[PDB]
Design a protein around this nucleic acid. Structure first.
Ligand SMILES: [Mg+2]
Lengths: 370, 386
RNA sequence: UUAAUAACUUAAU
């Protein structure tokens, strides 16, 4: 699957490793986030290990008349329910039918809850498969959108949870996932558990990253749910910054977010990954945004210490030994003080000597600046 | 509105005042013109006074736009695939009569409404048109809807359809000519032929000033006059209206395009003579305007039209108490430069040249014009200084 | 000789 490929390129979940670091970041937001709620979600995130590999899956005239008579008000609610109960053996197959999907929709709009629960009991094991179907997705979102009882939501949550990651990857399934935000806490929690645990894999997909943004901006996400996923975004920022989709989440985090200390906490974490981020074409752009920001001095200060005044200049050496990104980054960073500027000038000159750096197109500007 | 500004810079219509002068210009056009038809057009032009100030779109309702988009995509997809009967199309169209007016301006709906008029039979077209006609003008000036409005007009096959279009477009006709898209919507009605397309020429004659001064209306007038469905009476009505508005058209490049078209047309006889006769009574504004004076200068320099340059020069220099020349030489940026250019042109003579020199000398003295950069060159030409 | 198809910025029958 696409999940298998990104799971291989992400390693073990940062939520598994840094359960205590995530709890601290959520605490260190200074937003009064209840840690017991956050930890229990990390608990249920680790508890629920069922993760799916793939998603596994009455002629035209007769269906049209059913839909025609329902739209015409020609039916009683009890008359619709007799029809529905007589099609339970087929209602799952119909949910993906180009005509059946419109009928199953009408069935859920008008039947009473016990019949909706009877239909859903036959559909639930296929809801994720219907959810990614071009036709079926209209029925699956309608089913979730009209889920009114507790028995209905639990059935949807139970049979969607193993496929929640795979849904975020899908052009239609990620909207099906978002439909579950209606359930509110605690039923919609499974969405944020999956987003936090697989923030690396989901964040690197074209749809999942955009669906994460949507979930975090949703009015039914509690602060704790937001804090859990955002903290996961932060401790994965060194991985998300390496591709455009992950960068979208980080861009969203810096700009369109109300989280206090997000800039500082993001910089603090990225300071231990300066060699890889500042040598990557896209990640270096973010590292510069964190330093160039004048209103975040603690970030720029900690980022500059780890950048130039390192254990043995190994951080600065790695960056300047890179060809396509490294030296351009360091030259920029400095060319935007005067006493402080010469102090950085001193450290750059030492590394370029030990690099044996030639003054070709890579080192023209930087060698002149120091 | 933007219409209010064009009429304020035009004044009241020259068609109302000079109803008999237009009839005069129509005669001296030669041609096979039935003169009585022209006057009855000026009559219908003045009777029909219901003119709209603005163009209002159909009120927008609330739609689940993505369920609506999928529906329209499939309708267009199945029509293009021939999977639909003409009856199946008409069933769908009849179910959307409450919606065709608002859909006509939609990015997708406009393509579907087009197909509906291409494929439905005439009763269903008339049924759709009865819902769309009061907004056709609005649809007509929409960047999307104009494709649907022009289609509806181009496929108007019955008399009931043309009359509906003419009925519900006439109040907005002037507004359509002003619009970058609506002016093509108005031209689509030229297909209707005489006498149904006459409303286009009535509006062009009454509002010749406002329309002829606009980038799109002036070019639309030129297109209508060159259209194969414009009778000689319709051409003469509008061209004569252009002549009696020449002093206003000559003040911008769009109206000047109409006058340059008329002169280079060579189909209307006595165009140069009739144009100069009218422009001789408006020498104050033309000879002081940057662009209009260019035309007046061309009308005199033309040696092959001697009668025109004689009437122009008599009214230029020999006016009551010198008020025409006074106004021109009182102007700074255009006036004096024009008179000097008229003098220093070897086509006047010498008996008349001294007569012109006398009056200009008298005006500049009675103006108390100083010999600065404006009047230095001209003052030496008549005496004054050296 | 003035022409011209919307927005969205992850949607879709
Ligand atoms: Mg798009």
């Amino acid at each position: 699957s696409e999940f298998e490929l990104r799971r291989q390129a992400c390693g073990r979940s940062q939520l598994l490793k840094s359960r205590v670091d995530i709890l601290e970041v959520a605490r260190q937001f200074e937003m009064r986030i209840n840690l017991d709620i956050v930890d229990s979600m990390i608990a249920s995130a680790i508890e629920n290990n069922k993760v799916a590999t793939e998603i596994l899956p009455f002629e035209a005239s007769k269906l049209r008349e059913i839909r025609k008579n329902i739209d015409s008000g020609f039916y009683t609610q009890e008359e619709i329910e007799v029809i529905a109960r007589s099609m339970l053996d087929d209602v799952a197959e119909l949910s993906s039918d180009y005509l059946g999907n419109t009928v199953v929709q009408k069935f859920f709009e008008y039947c009473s809850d016990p019949i909706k629960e009877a239909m859903l009991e036959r559909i639930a094991p296929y809801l994720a498969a219907i959810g990614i179907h071009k036709n079926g997705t209209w029925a699956a979102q309608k089913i979730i959108d009209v889920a009114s009882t507790e028995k209905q939501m639990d059935l949807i949550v139970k049979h969607l949870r193993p496929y929640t990651a795979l849904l975020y990857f899908d052009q239609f399934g990620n909207y099906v996932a978002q439909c579950c935000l209606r359930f509110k806490y605690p039923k919609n929690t499974f969405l944020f558990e999956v987003m936090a645990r697989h923030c690396c894999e989901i964040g690197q997909s074209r749809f999942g990253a955009r669906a994460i943004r949507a979930c975090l901006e949703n009015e039914n996400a509690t602060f704790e749910q937001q804090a859990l996923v955002v903290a996961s975004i932060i401790i994965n920022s060194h991985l998300l910054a390496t591709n455009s989709n992950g960068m979208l989440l980080l861009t969203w985090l810096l700009d369109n977010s109300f989280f206090r200390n997000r800039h500082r906490l993001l910089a603090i974490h990225l300071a231990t990954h300066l060699h890889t981020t500042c040598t990557h074409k896209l990640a270096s752009t973010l590292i510069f945004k964190l330093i160039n920001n004048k209103q975040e001095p603690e970030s720029r200060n900690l980022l500059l210490k780890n950048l130039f005044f390192s254990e043995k200049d190994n951080v600065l050496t790695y960056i300047l030994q890179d060809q396509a990104v490294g030296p351009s980054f360091i030259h920029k960073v400095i060319t935007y003080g005067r006493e402080f500027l010469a102090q950085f000038h001193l450290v750059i000159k030492r590394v370029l000597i030990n690099i044996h750096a030639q003054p070709n197109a890579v080192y023209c500007r930087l060698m002149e600046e120091v």
